[PDB]
């Protein structure tokens, strides 16, 4: 049986979902928020955030249903949700308000763009931006996985105003993504995903084990330094639980894989992948794009490495073991591997240890 | 991977029988357990006391011959540099669970030290036979061993509140937590011929393990949905939910070393019942005095437990006893929904 609060039990009715899909989305949204934000004080903001995480979950599953251009419009209901009102309840009167409005809209925009019928030019530029540098992969994946959004929401649901610096958010995202992308590796590869750190860094277990161990070690140093503050614990709770959801949430396949993690041949998500089978402009969406994404989507073709292998159209069918975007050259792949292996110096700098 | 813990504990357990590597592994392991089990707290003083109590628990697991079990509950006494009874008073004194938690702590460390003596004591054999006598008894004794109700009570105390769970809430929570934890620790426990694993008794087929892990986790999500708005509710949730997850979150476990995977297959005068009975909680006092006439005679018992492939080190249940255990674990939903006040 799936469980979630009565408050949300009638959400997402009459939106194009089966009763099975709808109850799975609501349970997933609730579990994600409980796992990522276990400590809260404000129930009204907590439920608003659960509802926004439900819409995010719909955007990932069936993005065609979500009117991206209405998410930030006051008075507008998207699949029954007053999205801008929920964002205002959560973030209005905090220092991160205007930035989190663009973070939310930008995340859902590219979730919808990636499910689309045919590759848009926004999609193609995103696919090439994330392959263009490791720091740009981490910033854009941060938005895609809602890392800094969850951290700020966690602080807001404790009735405090987030005061992390830009470099603290970048350190937190690099730790969380390095862990999460490692555990999701086999699901993401079986689905020929573009948004996985190891699509660019390399598929060898030895690299993954090494940088996982370093990120978890830095996270334990961060936890030891920050655990006496509510804001500190709000960031720790979110980052630490990112990989653990593979075991804690009923959306993942821990039980169905024989109580295993990291074994692709017993995996229910990999076996599902194996068994399986009107154009938004930069102009129309720029109001909602955060600055790093705007620059990411306008990087000149010529200022990117010309040795890496791009294509006209990404997606379509691929062999077992292949991810779905830009294939880095040896020099670029060496650049990424070296950036990730250097995390400890960069982060002890960025986090103020 | 360097080890991290607070400065308040960094020079504990100095020059008292641990190697230098052992001592820092113990302090880091205690800190990591307490941070995973009790993520939400308000009282730093109580928190460090509990971390130090966990460090001593960790010495008893590893090196129980260093630990003077009979001085744990004695005012004024230092064990390995810790004023154990002062630490337990800082954490629990003036709560409704004070006396129960002194006994819960001492009873845990007593059997951790008994399990590693060179010679099996009488007391150790009676524990090994008691934990195999009924599934409800397995869960209560494993609760103390794993410190499930002690951690839940400590979590509430570290939020400056008075634990007010009922006996039957503690029993449901222990059943949920142990069913999950013993499942994830299954292969490690089997490799060490452990006695304290639910599946040593229920059986070793993966299908039973999957099914009852799915139910326990589903119950825990219903409990979390019902209780997540109070500090006491979250204190319980956080401990139970994180029990299986420490296999990924703690450096003590082998997630990384295993390829980012879970699941991959007479120095000593003997203690007597009478010398330790003051420190035992009621159910353990009773379990250690059960006549083996009142136990199932068809189960396979031994004169001496231990020695030795893919075998646990205690009582081997008979087919009928195994069926009783499996039925009990598979009936958890109804028992738990009743004990937890969902109906
Ligand atoms: Zn290149
Ligand atoms: Zn029997």
DSSP result, B203-251: ---HHHHHHHHHHHHHHHHHHHHHHTTSHHHHHHHHHHHHHHHHHHH-T
Q: What angle do CA A339, A344, A348 make, to 5 degrees?
A: 125
Choose the closest CB to A221 out of B4, B186, B228.
Answer: B4
**Burial (CB count within 10 angstroms: exposed 0-12, middle 13-18, buried 19+), residue A293:** buried
To the nearest 10°, the Cα dihedral for B92, B93, B96, B101? Answer: 50
Query: Whose atoms come closest to the Cα of B325: which ligand?
Result: 2
Question: Which residue's entry shows tokens 């990730």?
Answer: A340
At A286, list the tokens.
């720029």
Q: How many angstroms separate the CA atoms of A221 and A212, rounded?
A: 14
Q: Which residues pair with B300 in a beta bridge?
A: B316
Do A210 and B262 meet the contact criterion of CB atoms below 8 Å apart? Answer: no
The resolution of the experimental structure, rounded to one decimal in Å, is: 2.0
**Burial (CB count within 10 angstroms: exposed 0-12, middle 13-18, buried 19+), residue B321:** buried
- Please count the CA atoms within 13 angstroms of the CA of B282 that sit on its side-chain side: 3
Q: How many angstroms separate the CA atoms of B175 and B178, rounded?
A: 5
Q: Is A337 on the interface with B (CB under 8 A)?
A: no
Query: Whose atoms come closest to the Cα of A305: which ligand?
Result: 1
Which helix (H) or strand (E) segment is B129 a member of?
A: helix B122-131
At B144, list the tokens.
């103390």
- Identify the architecture of domain B7-339 in CATH: Orthogonal Bundle (1.10)
Give the list of residues 6+ apart from residue A217 with CB closer than 8 angstroms, or none: A344, B1, B2, B4, B251
User: Could you give phi then psi for residue B95, rounded to 5 degrees?
Assistant: -110, 160
CA A136–ligand 1 middle distance (angstroms): 15
CA A165 vs CA A152, A168, A264, A352: distances in Å: 11, 5, 38, 11
Cα B2 to chain centroid, rounded: 27
Q: How many angstroms separate the CA atoms of B343 and B337, rounded?
A: 7
CA A168–ligand 1 middle distance (angstroms): 29
Question: Which residue's entry shows tokens 């074994």?
Answer: A263
The 3-state DSSP class for residue A261 equals: strand
Which helix (H) or strand (E) segment is A195 a member of?
A: none
- Best interface-test mutation with A: which of B39, B48, B238 has the largest number of A CBs within 10 A? B39
Q: Is B176 on the interface with A (CB under 8 A)?
A: no
Put simply, the chain A residues between 239 and 268 with a CB less than 8 A from any chain B CB are 240, 243-244, 247-248, 250, 254-263
Q: How many angstroms separate the CA atoms of A181 and A197, rounded?
A: 6
Give the list of residues 6+ apart from residue A70 with CB closer than 8 angstroms, or none: A76, A78, A83
At A304, list the tokens.
């990117």
Q: How many angstroms separate the CA atoms of A258 and B210, rounded?
A: 6
Question: Which residue's entry shows tokens 């973070």?
Answer: A103
Q: Is A4 on the interface with B (CB under 8 A)?
A: yes
Contact A221 B6 (CB under 8 A): no
The 3-state DSSP class for residue A199 equals: helix
Q: How many angstroms separate the CA atoms of A171 and A268, rounded?
A: 33
At B6, list the tokens.
């607070």
Q: How many angstroms separate the CA atoms of B222 and A4, rounded?
A: 8
**Exposure string over A98-114, b if 16+ CB within 10 A, otherwise e:** ebbbbbbbbbbbbbbbb
The sign of the torsion formed by the CA atoms of B293, B297, B299, B301 equals positive
Breaks after residues in chain A, judged by C–N over 2.5 Å: 277
The 3-state DSSP class for residue B38 equals: coil
**CATH for A6-350, options being 1.20.120, 3.40.50, 1.10.600, 1.10.3470:** 1.10.600
Greatest Cα-to-Cα distance within chain A, rounded to the nearest angstrom:
55
**Experimental approach:** X-ray
Number of separate helices (H) and strands (E) present in chain A: 16, 0
Q: How many angstroms separate the CA atoms of B186 and B199, rounded?
A: 7
Q: How many angstroms separate the CA atoms of B87 and B64, rounded?
A: 19
Question: Which residue's entry shows tokens 């779905």?
Answer: A324
At B167, list the tokens.
């006996």
Where exactly are the structural domains of chain B?
Answer: 7-339
In the 8-state DSSP scheme, what is residue A78? Answer: B
The 3-state DSSP class for residue A81 equals: strand
At A157, list the tokens.
């649901």
Give the list of residues 6+ apart from residue A87 with CB closer than 8 angstroms, or none: A48, A52, A72, A100, A101, A104
Q: How many angstroms separate the CA atoms of A53 and A48, rounded?
A: 9
Contact A205 B259 (CB under 8 A): yes
Do A297 and A129 meet the contact criterion of CB atoms below 8 Å apart? Answer: yes
Cβ count within 10 A of residue B323: 12
At B332, list the tokens.
């958890």
Q: How many angstroms separate the CA atoms of B179 and B329, rounded?
A: 8
Query: Whose atoms come closest to the Cα of B201: which ligand?
Result: 2
The sign of the torsion formed by the CA atoms of A141, A124, A69, A192 equals negative
Do A314 and A119 meet the contact criterion of CB atoms below 8 Å apart? Answer: yes
For every residue of A90-154, DSSP letters joined together read HHTTSTTHHHHHHHHHHHHHHHHHHHSSS--HHHHHHHHHHTS-HHHHHHHHHHHHTHHHHHHHH
Q: How many angstroms separate the CA atoms of A339 and B164, rounded?
A: 51
Q: Is A230 on the interface with B (CB under 8 A)?
A: no
Do A280 and A201 meet the contact criterion of CB atoms below 8 Å apart? Answer: no
Q: Is B188 on the interface with A (CB under 8 A)?
A: no
Contact A250 B210 (CB under 8 A): no
Q: Is B6 on the interface with A (CB under 8 A)?
A: yes
The alpha-carbon gap from A289 to the nearest alpha carbon of chain B, in Å, equals 35
Cα-only R_g, chain B: 19
Cα B24 to chain centroid, rounded: 22
For every residue of B42-104, DSSP letters joined together read S-HHHHHHHHHHHHHHHHHHHHGGG--GGGTTSTT--BTTB-HHHHHHHHHTTSTTHHHHHHH
For every residue of A265-331, DSSP letters joined together read TT-HHHHHHHH------HHHHGGG--HHHHHHHH--GGGS-SSSB--SS--S---TT--SS-B--HH
Size of interface A-B (CB pairs under 8 A): 115
Contact B249 A236 (CB under 8 A): no
**Exposure string over A205-214, b if 16+ CB within 10 A, otherwise e:** eebbbbbbbb
Give the list of residues 6+ apart from residue A340 with CB closer than 8 angstroms, or none: A134, A178, A197, A201, A207, A211
The 3-state DSSP class for residue A20 equals: helix
Cα B316 to chain centroid, rounded: 22
Put simply, the chain B residues between 40 and 69 with a CB less than 8 A from any chain A CB are 40, 44
Q: What angle do CA B50, A242, A285 make, to 5 degrees?
A: 140
Choose the closest CB to A34 out of B209, B222, B228.
Answer: B228
Contact A248 B245 (CB under 8 A): yes
């Amino acid at each position: 049986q799936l469980h979630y609060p009565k408050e949300i039990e009638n959400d997402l009715m009459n939106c194009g979902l089966t009763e099975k899909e709808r109850v799975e989305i609501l349970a997933t949204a609730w579990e994600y928020v409980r796992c990522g934000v276990p400590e809260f004080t404000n129930w009204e903001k907590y439920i608003a955030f659960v509802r926004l995480t439900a819409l995010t979950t719909v955007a990932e599953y069936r993005g065609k249903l979500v009117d991206i251009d209405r998410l930030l419009t006051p008075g507008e209901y998207v699949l029954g949700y007053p999205v801008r009102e929920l964002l205002d309840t959560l973030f209005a009167g905090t220092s991160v308000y205007e930035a989190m409005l663009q973070e939310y809209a930008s995340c859902l925009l590219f979730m919808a763009e990636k499910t689309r019928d045919h590759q848009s030019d926004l999609c193609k530029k995103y696919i090439e931006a994330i392959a263009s540098s490791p720091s740009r992969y981490y910033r854009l994946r941060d938005c895609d996985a809602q890392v800094r959004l969850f951290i700020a929401a966690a602080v807001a649901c404790n009735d405090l105003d987030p005061d992390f610096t830009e470099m603290e958010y970048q350190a937190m995202a690099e730790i969380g993504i390095t862990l999460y992308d490692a555990v999701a590796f086999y699901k993401h590869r079986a689905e020929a995903e573009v948004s996985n750190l190891y699509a660019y860094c390399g598929q060898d277990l030895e690299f993954r084990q090494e940088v996982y161990q370093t990120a978890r070690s830095t996270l334990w140093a961060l936890e030891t330094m920050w655990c006496k503050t509510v804001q500190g614990r709000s960031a720790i709770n979110l980052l630490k639980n990112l990989p653990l959801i593979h075991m804690s949430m009923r959306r993942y396949r821990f039980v169905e894989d024989g109580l295993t993690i990291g074994k692709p041949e017993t995996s229910a998500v990999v076996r599902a992948a194996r068994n399986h089978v009107m154009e938004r402009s930069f102009e129309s969406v720029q109001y909602m794009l955060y600055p790093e994404l705007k620059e990411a989507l306008q990087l000149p073709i010529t200022e990117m490495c010309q040795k890496c292998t791009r294509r006209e159209v990404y997606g379509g069918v691929s062999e077992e073991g292949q991810f779905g975007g830009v294939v880095l050259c040896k020099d670029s792949q060496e650049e990424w591997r070296h950036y990730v292996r250097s995390s400890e110096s960069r982060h002890l700098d960025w986090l103020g240890f």
